[PDB]
Amino acid sequence: NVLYENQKLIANQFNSAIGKIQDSLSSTASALGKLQDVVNQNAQALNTLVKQLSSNFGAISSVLNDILSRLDKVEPDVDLGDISGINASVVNIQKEIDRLNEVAKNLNESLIDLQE
Amino acid sequence: TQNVLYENQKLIANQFNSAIGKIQDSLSSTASALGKLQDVVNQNAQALNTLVKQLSSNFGAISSVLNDILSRLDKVEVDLGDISGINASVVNIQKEIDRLNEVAKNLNESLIDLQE
Amino acid sequence: TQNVLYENQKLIANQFNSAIGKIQDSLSSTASALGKLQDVVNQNAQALNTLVKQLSSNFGAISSVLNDILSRLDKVEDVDLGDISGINASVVNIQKEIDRLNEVAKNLNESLIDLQE
Ligand SMILES: [Zn+2]
Ligand SMILES: [Zn+2]
Ligand SMILES: [Zn+2]
Ligand SMILES: [Zn+2]
C-alpha cells in the first residue's frame, strides 16, 4: 500500500543525497589539488630564493674581504650567516586526492534501482 | 503481518537522517579547514613576495655602495644575481569552499519524513 | 508482493551500508590530506621566518662593515638599508577540523543497518 510509496521516497532521497555527496567529494579533491600545487610552487620559490641568496652573500663577502685587504695595504675577516641549511619541504597528498575521485565515481555503484 | 517491514523502513530512515546529519557536519568542517589553509597559504605567499621585493631593493643599494667604494679605492691607490624573478603564486579555492557549504545546506532537502 | 518489498528493503540497507563505508574511507583520506597540508604549510612558514631572521642579521653585519669601510676611506682621503625583520609568515591551526572528520568517520558506524531476518 503506502509501504511501496515510502520505499520509492527513501530510494529517491538516498540517490539524491549520494549525488550531492559525489559533487562534494569531487570539489574536495579539486580544492586539495589546487592547495598541493600552490604549496609546492611556494616551497620551490623559497628553495630557489635560498640558493640564489647564498650565491649573492658568497659574492658580497668575497668583495668585502678584498676591499678590507686593499684597505690594509692603503692603511680580521667578514663572515656572513649561512642561510643554505634553510629548506622548504614539499607535500604529497596525490594518493588521497586520487582516493576521493575514486570514491566519487565508485558511489554510482551504491545507487538504488528498486524492483518495479 | 507487515509490521517488520514498516519498523525496518523507520530504522532505515532514522539511520539515513542520522548519517546525513554527520556528513553535513563533516562537509562544514572540511570547508572551514580549506578556508583557513587558503588564508595562511596566501599570507605566506605575500610575505615571500614582500621579502623578495625588499631584498632586490637592499642588493641594489649594496652593489651601488660597493661600486662607489671600489672607485674611491682605485683613486686612493660588482654585479650580483637578480632574485626579483622569484615569485610565490596564490591559490583560489573559494569556489570549492562555496560548493561544500552549498551541499551541506542542500542535504536538508535529502532528509526523509516517512508517510503515516 | 511482500517478497519484493522485503528484497527491496535488503537492497536499500546493503546499498546504504556500502555508500557509508565508501564515505568513511573518503572522510579519512580528507583528514590525512589536510594533516599533511597543515604540517608542510607550517614547516614552510617557519623556514621563511628563520630565513627572515638570519637575513636581517646578515644585512646588519654588511651595513656595519660598509660604514666602517666608508669612515676608513674618509680618513685616507650612517648610510644603511631596508628593514625586513617586520616580514613574518603566519602558521595555520586546523587540528580541530581534522579531529572532527576522523570523529565523524568513526561515528558513521552507528548509522549502519543490521542483519534483520
Ligand atoms: Zn554530480
Ligand atoms: Zn687582512
Ligand atoms: Zn579565504
Ligand atoms: Zn660588472
Author numbering:
A (entry chain B): 914 to 988, 1162 to 1202
B (entry chain A): 912 to 988, 1164 to 1202
C (entry chain C): 912 to 988, 1163 to 1202
Q: What do the study's own words say?
A:
After binding of RBD in S1 subunit of S protein on the virion to the ACE2 receptor on the target cell, the heptad repeat 1 (HR1) and 2 (HR2) domains in its S2 subunit of S protein interact with each other to form a six-helix bundle (6-HB) fusion core, bringing viral and cellular membranes into close proximity for fusion and infection. S2 subunit contains fusion peptide (FP), heptad repeat 1 (HR1), heptad repeat 2 (HR2), transmembrane domain (TM) and cytoplasmic domain (CP).
To understand the structural basis of the interactions between HR1 and HR2 regions of SARS-CoV-2, a fusion protein containing the major parts of HR1 (residues 910–988) and HR2 (residues 1162–1206) with a flexible linker (L6, SGGRGG) in between was constructed for crystallographic study. The crystal structure of HR1-L6-HR2 shows a canonical 6-HB structure with a rod-like shape 115 Å in length and 25 Å in diameter. The three HR1 domains form a parallel trimeric coiled-coil center, around which three HR2 domains are entwined in an antiparallel manner. The interaction between these two domains is predominantly a hydrophobic force. Each pair of two adjacent HR1 helices forms a deep hydrophobic groove, providing the binding site for hydrophobic residues of the HR2 domain, including V1164, L1166, I1169, I1172, A1174, V1176, V1177, I1179, I1183, L1186, V1189, L1193, L1197 and I1198. The overall 6-HB structure of SARS-CoV-2 is similar to that of other HCoVs with root-mean-square deviation (RMSD) of 0.36 Å to SARS-CoV 6-HB and 0.66 Å to MERS-CoV 6-HB for all the Cα atoms. Inside the fusion core region of HR1 domain, there are 8 different residues, which may contribute the enhanced interactions between HR1 and HR2 and stabilize 6-HB conformation of SARS-CoV-2 as revealed by crystallographic analysis, compared with those of SARS-CoV. K933 forms a new interaction with N1192 in SARS-CoV-2 with a distance of 2.7 Å, whereas the corresponding position in SARS-CoV has no such interaction. However, when T925 was mutated to S943, it could bind to E1182 in the HR2 domain with a hydrogen bond 2.6 Å in distance, and K947 could also bind to E1182 through a salt bridge 3.0 Å in distance.
